[PDB]
């Protein structure tokens, strides 16, 4: 976790709280110590104390996977990670409690379109702020290189053919 990115962690958490506050004023939510849903009263104005940071917490983890591992590629990779951590949680807890079978206990290349978009939304939400802040990231001519490799392979094959024709 770099210093400047750690400094931006709190700023982006604040900005996401701003976005969520706009959403919940559009919905209608007034601060109130009593916990309820049908009374539309919550003390952090249904996002509770910890629930307000359940989404801020894995931003540092997303950055750590960024550093340990173009833009569309990391978007889909962070989507895959966001769903894989959820699958790990789910399967470990279900192995502990001996529960039923989840339809999401399958490789990521078989999931339904909505299950991928659900985490792709959070992925793009955390990515657009990194883009506006000037962070160039990648995954971490091509045709000419391919042609050159083919030529090298052809040279090897020609050496082999010469060896064969010599016999």
Swiss-Prot record:
Residue stretches of each sequence repeat: 70-140
When the coding gene is removed by deletion, what phenotypic consequences does the entry describe?
Answer: Embryonically lethal. Embryos die at about 10 dpc, due to defects in heart tube development. Cardiac myotubes display enlarged rough endoplasmic reticulum and cytoplasmic vesicles that contain high levels of Ca(2+).
Tissue-by-tissue expression: Highly expressed in heart, lung, cerebellum and brain. Detected at lower levels in adrenal gland, stomach, thymus, esophagus and ovary.
PTM summary from the entry reads: Channel activity is modulated by phosphorylation. Phosphorylation is increased in failing heart, leading to calcium leaks and increased cytoplasmic Ca(2+) levels.
Q: Any idea where this protein resides?
A: Sarcoplasmic reticulum membrane
Q: What is known of its domains?
A: The calcium release channel activity resides in the C-terminal region while the remaining part of the protein resides in the cytoplasm.
The entry's family comment says: Belongs to the ryanodine receptor (TC 1.A.3.1) family. RYR2 subfamily.
How does this protein assemble? Answer: Homotetramer. Can also form heterotetramers with RYR1 and RYR3. Interacts with CALM and S100A1; these interactions regulate channel activity. Identified in a complex composed of RYR2, FKBP1B, PKA catalytic subunit, PRKAR2A, AKAP6, and the protein phosphatases PP2A and PP1. Interacts directly with FKBP1B, PKA, PP1 and PP2A. Interacts with FKBP1A and FKBP1B; these interactions may stabilize the channel in its closed state and prevent Ca(2+) leaks. Interacts with SELENON. Identified in a complex, composed of FSD2, CMYA5 and RYR2.
Q: What function does the entry list?
A: Cytosolic calcium-activated calcium channel that mediates the release of Ca(2+) from the sarcoplasmic reticulum into the cytosol and thereby plays a key role in triggering cardiac muscle contraction. Aberrant channel activation can lead to cardiac arrhythmia. In cardiac myocytes, calcium release is triggered by increased Ca(2+) cytosolic levels due to activation of the L-type calcium channel CACNA1C. The calcium channel activity is modulated by formation of heterotetramers with RYR3. Required for cellular calcium ion homeostasis. Required for embryonic heart development.
- Write down what this protein is called: Ryanodine receptor 2
Organism per entry: Mus musculus
Gene designation: Ryr2
